[PDB]
Amino acid sequence: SRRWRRWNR
Amino acid sequence: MIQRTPKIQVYSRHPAENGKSNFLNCYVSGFHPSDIEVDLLKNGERIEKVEHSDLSFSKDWSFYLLYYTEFTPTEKDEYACRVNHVTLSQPKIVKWDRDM
Amino acid sequence: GSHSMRYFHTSVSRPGRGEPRFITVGYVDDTLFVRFDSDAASPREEPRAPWIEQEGPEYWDRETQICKAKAQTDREDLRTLLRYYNQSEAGSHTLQNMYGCDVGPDGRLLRGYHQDAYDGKDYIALNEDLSSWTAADTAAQITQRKWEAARVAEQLRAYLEGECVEWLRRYLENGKETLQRADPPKTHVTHHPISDHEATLRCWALGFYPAEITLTWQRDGEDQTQDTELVETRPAGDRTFQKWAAVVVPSGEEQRYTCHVQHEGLPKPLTLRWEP
Fold this sequence. Notes:
heterotrimer, B: mainly beta, Immunoglobulin-like, 5-stranded antiparallel sheet, 4-stranded antiparallel sheet, 9 strands, elongated, C: alpha+beta, Murine Class I Major Histocompatibility Complex, H2-DB, Chain A, domain 1, 8-stranded antiparallel sheet, 4 helices, globular, host-virus interaction (chain C), TAP binding (chain C), immunity (chain C), adaptive immunity (chain C)
């Protein structure tokens, strides 16, 4: 199952 | 941009036996950038229904793809995979050798 | 033995041809189990292994939202990186990311990964400590400063040590009949005359799983690394793998050469010779 949280570079 | 030329292997899923249904594979790997044209050919002619895996990559970031089609090998029929990439001045054509 | 789960992501810009293409795949060990392609007619994450199909609709909805959201962040990041690298809008550029976990036979975390590449070269990587970064160039240092502020490393640590290992454990059990049953290679040695004085010996390994294998030719019990042609391990397309190794030998000296095969599916490592 994938990680939910995301962050821009 | 660093560019990396594709490695190419052409082979069958199972031991080739004449008259018996099988899968012809063309595996391209070690390449960058990801844009690539790959065709499977039967006696010089482009094979119509060719499927492919979804784009993925190795530890070193280089891409790989598997192209494949259901086929029946015979004694006289020739098969090959034709590959074009930005690193190539002309498309590379690798013949299918049933012992390779 | 030991196991892994990995998610791979690739975005490729295509100036003048619409929005970047996003493709992501997931693996357990060497088994592809999920896929998403932003160019599919109606994009959703889809199953690619029978043991994942049992997951409920809520699973597929969440996975699909994550993929779509990741595609959007990569579109934004491609535009940001043109500014970081002072690049024009003329060229195609590539962002890659891989993350996941390696576990031991006890299902405990051995190593977590989260690492990125731009135009095929290292951009930024989470270190093995799961608390610090390796940034490859001055652009990636900007990203590092942003990610330190936002405690990205701490959040990845929590994901990789928890969710990643646990979902891997779940998949291994659900898929045990195929994931935890190694298929040993089927092997044979072939002989091919080149001339009256020499011949090729080719050692074949077919239908094996997982992909990790060692195929070596020895002469008089010594490894022949220099003289051995060894092809990249290749997918058969039915979830198993293929590989061969070949040496060129003098006519009549074939009995001096042994092919050695190591694979986890074999009870014992094999020693093969050509049988005339």
